Amino acid sequence: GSCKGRCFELQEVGPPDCRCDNLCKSYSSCCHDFDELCLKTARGWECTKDRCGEVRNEENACHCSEDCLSRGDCCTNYQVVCKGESHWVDDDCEEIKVPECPAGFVRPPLIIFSVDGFRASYMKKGSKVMPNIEKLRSCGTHAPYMRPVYPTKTFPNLYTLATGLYPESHGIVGNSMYDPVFDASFHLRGREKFNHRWWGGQPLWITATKQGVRAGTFFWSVSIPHERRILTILQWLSLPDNERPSVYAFYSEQPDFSGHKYGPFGPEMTNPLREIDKTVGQLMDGLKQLRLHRCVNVIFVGDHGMEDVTCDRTEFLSNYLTNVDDITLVPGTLGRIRAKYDPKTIIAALTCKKPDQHFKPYMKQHLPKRLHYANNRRIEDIHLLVDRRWHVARKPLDVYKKPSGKCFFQGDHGFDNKVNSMQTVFVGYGPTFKYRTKVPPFENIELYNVMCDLLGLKPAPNNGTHGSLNHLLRTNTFRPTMPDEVSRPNYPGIMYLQSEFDLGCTCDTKERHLLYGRPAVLYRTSYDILYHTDFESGYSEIFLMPLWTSYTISKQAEVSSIPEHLTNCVRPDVRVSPGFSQNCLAYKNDKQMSYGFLFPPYLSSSPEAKYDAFLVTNMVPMYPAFKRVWAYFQRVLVKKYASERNGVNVISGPIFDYNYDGLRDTEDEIKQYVEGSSIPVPTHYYSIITSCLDFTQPADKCDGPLSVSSFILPHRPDNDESCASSEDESKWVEELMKMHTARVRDIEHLTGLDFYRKTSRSYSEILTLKTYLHTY
Ligand SMILES: CC(C)CCC[C@@H](C)[C@H]1CC[C@H]2[C@@H]3[C@H](O)C=C4C[C@@H](O)CC[C@]4(C)[C@H]3CC[C@]12C
Ligand SMILES: *[C@@H]1O[C@H](CO)[C@@H](O[C@@H]2O[C@H](CO)[C@@H](O)[C@H](O)[C@H]2NC(C)=O)[C@H](O)[C@H]1NC(C)=O
Ligand SMILES: CCCCCc1cc(O)c2c(c1)OC(C)(C)[C@@H]1CC[C@@H](C)C[C@H]21
Ligand SMILES: [Ca+2]
Ligand SMILES: [Zn+2]
Ligand SMILES: [Zn+2]
Helix, strand or coil, X not given: CCCCCCCCCCCCCCCCCCECCCCCCCCCCECCCHHHHCCCCECCCCCCXXXXXXXXXXXXXXXXXXXXXXXXXXXXXHHHHHXXXXXXXXXXXXXXXXXXXXXXXXXXXXXXXXXXXXXXXXXXCCCCCCHHHHHHHHHCEEEEEEECCXXXXXXXXXXXXXXXXXXXXXXXXXXXXXXXXXXXXXXXCCCHHHCHHHCCCCCHHHHHHHCCCCECCCCCCCCCCHHHHHHHHHHHHCCCCCCCCCEEEEEEEEEHHHHHHHCCCCHHHHHHHHHHHHHHHHHHHHHHXXXXXXXXXXXXXXXXXXXXXXXXXXXXXXXXXXXXXXXXXXXXXXXXEEECCCXXXXXXXXXXXXXXXXXXXXXXXXXXXXXXXXXXXXXXXXXEEECCCCEXXXXXXXXXXXXXXXXXXXXXXXXXXXXXXXXXXEEEECCCECCCEECCCEEHHHHHHHHHHHHCCCCCCCCCCCCCCHHHECCCCCCCCCCCCCECCECCCCCCCHHHCCCXXXXXXXXXXXXXXXXXXXXXXXXXXXXXXXXXXXXXXCCCEEEEEEEEECCCCCCCCCCHHHCCCCECCCCCCHHHCCCHHHHHHCCCXXXXXXXXXXXXXXXXXXXXXXXXXXXXXXXXXXXXXHHHHHHHHHHHHHHHHCCEEEEEEEECCCCCCCCCCCHHHCCCECCCCCCECXXXXXEEEEEECCCCCCHHHCCCCEEEEEEEEECCCCCCCCCCCCCCHHHCHHHHHHHCEECHHHHHHHHCEECCCCCXXXXXXXXXXXXXXXXX
């Protein structure tokens, strides 16, 4: 019934037994003397010279007695004030080429220092403001920014960091959510979040325990001062080998709290940042005191950024909907709508109704695929993507203001995760991280694999690309290998005569076009390689269209028209059986479906070669509304990119994701066909556009690193997503494409293909390339 000698113990305790641990306050379970014994604060957190050599007083928050080093409970500045040592931050950067750990350490510990709402740009404040953090950043490995997941809220991003999973897979899809199977709601405040039923995946602290690596408790009741959290981690590090954890986590609620109150830009943000730096300094001073400052790996990481948002920039559903009292809204920097009613009516009422409307409604299946925010029963079908700096609310009455008329907050977050203000920080420091090294920005889903590597753990299955972050680490125990191709292509010659085709249609070396090798098909299927003067394709005899079409456009390439006599021309391909070709009469009978081509006739190298572009094996089903988008991309944008990037290689193709799980559909999952036909209708079309990062070299003669931009365009029968679509395509199509930017890895998941298999680059480098997102 007493916490004597068990303050912040690692041994778990059950009810009704009173507890003395990190979370006993959060479970209303602390022993009567927890606050007295474990939350001491007398004399503060810093030794002073007058305290050096004191007789131990068990009342003090920390100790400066000669016995404190053996007891493991000195104040973090004890050796500086009492033994003449230097603060860690005052010491010169020295490379840590191998760990320097006490005998009996079996691995270098990992300490995760997480900060809430730490915007990437805050790092541009001085060593003046954050000298300890700046030394970690400059001496260790850092990225200019780390990209959070959507929504850019605390619980989804912390749990993604811990699991390597998109929120739709780990289940924490918001700070609040409703689960219809549970018939219950989850909120940041309250006891519901403590129920294990909500939490999927396998977080780092569980992966470690299952594999025999002890974790310190990652979570801290708000009642525990930051200084005491640091001292507790330092005390655990002095435990004996059979008890000492290998992995630890510190969490700070700052700078998120002051960011909400004052916004991200005020001078008021300086002192919160100074206080975080002071806490980092206590940790590093304390590690140096224990001679562990060249043994431990430290990660300084944020969950999301912070944007300028005031209650004066709020859109109200009551200005759009006939009755907002038959709906429930998750409001704020995003919107989720459910019935408290008809979805199609609601979407229409929210679509391009006011000139500068500051949100856009989506059925969740139509959200940009890069958000990976659909495949979970907790994600409402109706979603509102809110413009940065804005809020959406149900009615004007939901906006609260002070008596003076000013809002209660000036900052918020939650927006689209490619928004610059939502980016956050990553620094890694220690023997296993690289020395004085800058790495490209990366997504927070990748970090779980790295933390597993740092601890010698086998990661649970996750959404990271293991290997894509090897360049962060000085020593790699994981070496990725390219997946073996599952299906091998056929190379069919001239097989049939034109007169053998049914078929409804009427019409009046490959060193150049496959620059990085043939894509590997990673599932069983039947497909043909087809060569042409201007493009190469892998044609699926199962889906009756190419899985991929590859072609290279030089800087000097000319765009030409489709001659009038060829406007409706479609030609049989004598290499491919009539039984494995599309049927032109199907498109005539489908009044709502037209077709387009994957290699564009506009980019043919000659009038003779243009006929190849009209082969039935180059044709794909396209809604007339989508053809406006695709024709502009094909006729205008490809040439633009080629002219800007010193040539481009393009790989385009279809995607089928009817169950919106981000993975290629099986034939049985396809829910729409061209009417009366076996021709499946894609849900999306992709394109991957590659050139030389060194733009002084043409795309086809690139010696070094590659540059890539890709897209996954929704194949929709209207352009309701584009409020300016009544105008010329030059006014809206490129904005649509930028919203639907994607990683090559995203396309690989959705197609079952593997790209960049034949290059001069290391596989590690290619994995980094495949996880790149061009954000615009
Ligand atoms: C009130 C705050 C200060 C702290 C709230 C912490 C709460 C979210 C934490 C406390 C214990 C956590 C669970 C615990 O680690 C057991 C697991 C196993 C894992 O397999 C799934 C996650 C889960 C349920 C943790 C979820 C987060 C919890 C509830
Ligand atoms: C993200 O990672 C998860 C975990 O590996 C993937 O979900 C797994 O998907 C397989 C294949 O469908 C299922 O058998 C498992 O049940 C899933 N596990 C979990 C925990 O979700 C998911 O497909 C990945 N997402 C993307 C877009 O690739
Ligand atoms: C995996 C390495 C990086 C971070 C680990 C970590 C530490 C945490 O403290 C928390 C994490 C994650 O995620 C959840 C559980 C959603 C939390 C919700 C409440 C907050 C007060 C603290 C929490
Ligand atoms: Ca699918
Ligand atoms: Zn947060
Ligand atoms: Zn916040």
